[PDB]
Symmetry: D2
């Protein structure tokens, strides 16, 4: 009596017709957001290249490839890059760029494949390991805690760590959600990796479940040719002391750990409130 | 009071997490369905190559690329192929095959891009037009009549025909929906193009609105342990209506002939075909 | 990652806020639809009154009460009426009539209660059974074949039949779906029971699953103050005459006399006149 | 290509089938919840009667009638009661109870009707108003702030206040969301009005938007032999004291005397006892 009937199952597609909600207004502005990646900051490039070079890294795994934009810098600079992502919609962009650039030998050797943190050990044979694994741009916080005990967080971080060769590097970040939770507000424009060209106004919604922070949901209203349209994304608010604990546990404690606040050294109680924390772990070996 | 809160907008994605429903039970069985194209029939191949060679075709546009399997055959047999689809999810597979095979010069020159029939003129640069344009496997029927008057069907066909050079070819098919509507059932295993290896149980639902057929919806049950289901829907194009629609896309300025399962179709013939294939030659 | 989250559970309510979708536009036009009962046809009232008095019935159970319009005539005419529906939203209108009219002794004695066909034996005490059980206005057709073997239709009918005393009557109707399946079209304003005052356009959608009729879905479009249009949707199971003749007798184990009427007159198969409704009159000899 | 097909519009019903989601599990457990009122605390009754007898009240409007339980006590105690709710589903049970007791004239005179705080002006004939208007049980908090500016809250209160006769009372409560927001947890079984017989485990979700509390959503889990667990969800606007104090005064344009109670006893700011409910009692200047 109350049942509803779909024309096609959730998740299925067909020749000649766009995929489900592919062409909606939220999707359209979201696409402008993920493309707002044209200006890589000098300090980002200089910091990452410096840290990879300082450790002699050659073989790099990017486990949050997205559109490829972090991985493309490394390809251009002569690293042997493998890049993976669980999201096909985002990988589509990385693959397209690689295809356009395929006559450049460095791009012909760029590996791009579907993989999920939760199955990474299977989806990507480690061999002996990578020299560096990177997970930057606050991508780790895209994974929610839908079971309630952060067991998925721990599995994902363990699998990401298992990709690092002994003596190798993991570099993994999060936005400063300690500040977001204390103020209730996640302001726009602060991406330290790519300088934003897109003008965005953000509403921040924080869900607390029995007094424990559970989700941060950001509603973006983006001015476009004029025009004025909205999309929504959500994030797990990782706080610094928990993530410090988690990321070291993923290695069995067999790691040296340090934390940066926006590319610079971080020490508690410093005047400067970083936008992002960047954890750097050298696995024992 | 009655509102629901989403975690993310319809159609958006994020690094590190699978796209919406992409790992569901439906998507997983559907993937086996779209993958069932390992045994291309000898008749399909020999027919299509013959038609293209008899008309001297070299530049080919595939407007329903999907996983690329129709295109791959033409790429291997020496044609210059451009393949488009509105569906990134299916295009993903064609793109992967091109990349795996990229060291073959033929595959290096295979052009694959996203394009929608409703905006094809804008999405697909046509130069002076293609020698042949193909839309096979009953892909056209994927497009519904949302407006009610079949105006989208007309626009899609106009735009697909606009890709044809004067003197060129369009080859476009549909399943025999005359027969399916008369029986109420669309049985499995009848694909004339690719010999199925997957066993499917199909339930067929036909919706008729004010006595005009409007949608054929198929529920497929396949073994994957584990019977899983997925649903797809189809506009049930009948032969007389489609013949008129396809000629009207050219403005009447075309020669038109109909085949049934690769052979000329003679109305009154005993055999009732599983597919009708329309072969058009544009004036010029 | 794909989860949605509700402000309140499906089905639930709270003081000071309207019930889920209760104030929607579709709901508001549908309320006009179900209120379109100010004009009981004389032919109707004459036929049912005459059929009940012919069989000397006094204790009557209406199993599709609704807003109560059918039961109300009977109440006015001095029957002892028990009226039952599975839908509380509908039952609400009947209750409200009973309350306005409560100082009339007949309305004081009218029983109105919720009950479901599918659990009717438990939901209603029958005693030895009612002299007549009535299910009119094409309400039976409201129950879909969700399982696909019509097991629920047989259960509903079995339970409705068990409410009739021995030598008692079941009067149960259905619109003429043979006709509707043959033209694909359910024409508007044919209600033989209440002449309709509300003008609506209807779109008829028929779903056949594996060549068997499964559902008829009607979209009703009604005019509103550039003046606008608002629609609502209701769906029905398309009972054909042959099948239903089988099902309704089966519900008594074949221990019944059965006749079919077409729009209150005797139906003869092959007759030229094509009825809007078929009413099955069954007398339990059993 | 991505469309769905409903069987029936949102909000609509049909004879012989249950209303939408009416028989779901969440809805079943929730019926036990709103039914958990067999045990009015002796202290509530004494307090409210004392209060109303004190001011000489006779005609009382309950603007959050629900199942009728606040209002039934008042009918029993010889008040002239009009009870309203926007929820037809809760109101069902109040109307059931009046019918059941109609042979007592006090209940024959009890007026029960549907009305919404946001259109209360129209939905109730005010006359020169009521001696007292009660909105108790934390019902007001059921109204969300969907426009973002509390304009619905203001309209709702202003309309409630207009029902009060010159020199009459408004008595309106809210749970202590100051406390719930500080701890993040809504303790179960603290209803000061009716003692819970029913054991529920509560999860409390607080949504904050741009650092402003917007919504508290309670998930209620109850036990069922077979023992397994079943839940339902309700949501509330977290009114803080200082805010609600301002809003309730504004509803009368300040032409009122206001005092606040904490669990039936006078509230003295800074007191060590943290109350479960704040009850605001206002006398209209007139
Ligand atoms: C409809 N929503 C809504 C709105 N704001 C406005 N203006 N209107 C609305 O309708 N925001 C909140 C509300 C819905 N409320 C809620 C409350 C709690 C949870 C909740 O349980 N949320 C978790 C799920 C936990 C999990 O399974 O991991 C969540 O992630 O949101 C969800 C929605
Ligand atoms: C098989 N294609 C083709 C042809 N005709 C010629 N001579 N060559 C071809 O490759 N006719 C049919 C078809 C048309 N294809 C195309 C492909 C690309 C562009 C095009 O892109 N033209 C650009 C330059 C490059 C670019 O846009 O990226 C332009 O600016 O005009 C046009 C027509
Ligand atoms: C979205 N719907 C839609 C429309 N028409 C238009 N113009 N636009 C639309 O989006 N009508 C059909 C379509 C959906 N298609 C279908 C296809 C099959 C079934 C189907 O299975 N229907 C039965 C269910 C069987 C049961 O569970 O008992 C049904 O009752 O509809 C439903 C809808
Ligand atoms: C956590 N407290 C508490 C609760 N219940 C609720 N709802 N709120 C609460 O804060 N239950 C237990 C405890 C009760 N607190 C109190 C606080 C003061 C007085 C009170 O008025 N006490 C006397 C005695 C003072 C003394 O001995 O010093 C007084 O008049 O001060 C009573 C209970």
């Amino acid at each position: 009596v109350d049942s509803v009937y779909r024309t096609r199952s959730l998740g299925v597609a067909a020749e000649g017709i766009p995929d489900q909600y592919a062409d909606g207004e939220a999707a359209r502005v979201w696409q402008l957001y993920i493309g707002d990646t044209r200006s890589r900051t000098a300090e980002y490039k200089a910091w990452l290249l410096g840290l990879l070079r300082q450790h002699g890294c050659h073989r790099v795994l990017d486990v949050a490839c997205g559109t490829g934009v972090d991985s493309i810098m490394l390809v251009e600079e002569g690293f042997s890059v493998t890049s993976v992502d669980a999201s096909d919609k985002m990988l589509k962009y990385a693959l397209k760029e690689r295809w356009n650039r395929r006559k450049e030998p460095a791009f012909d050797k760029w590996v791009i494949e579907e993989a999920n943190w939760l199955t990474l050990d299977k989806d990507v044979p480690a061999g002996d390991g990578f020299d560096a694994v990177i997970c930057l741009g606050n991508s780790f916080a895209h994974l929610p805690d839908s079971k309630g005990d952060q067991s998925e967080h721990r599995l994902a971080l363990k699998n990401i760590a298992s990709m690092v060769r002994p003596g190798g590097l993991l570099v993994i970040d999060h936005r400063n959600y300690d500040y977001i939770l204390s103020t209730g507000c996640a302001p726009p424009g602060k991406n330290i990796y790519y300088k934003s060209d897109l003008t965005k106004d953000i509403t921040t919604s924080v869900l607390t479940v029995n007094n424990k922070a559970h989700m941060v949901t950001l509603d973006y209203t983006v001015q476009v040719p004029p025009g004025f349209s909205k999309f929504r994304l959500s994030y797990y608010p990782h706080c610094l002391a928990s993530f410090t604990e988690l990321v070291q546990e993923a290695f069995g404690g067999r790691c040296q750990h340090s934390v940066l606040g926006d590319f610079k050294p971080y020490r508690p109680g410093q005047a400067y409130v970083p936008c992002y924390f960047i954890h750097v772990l050298k696995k024992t070996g």
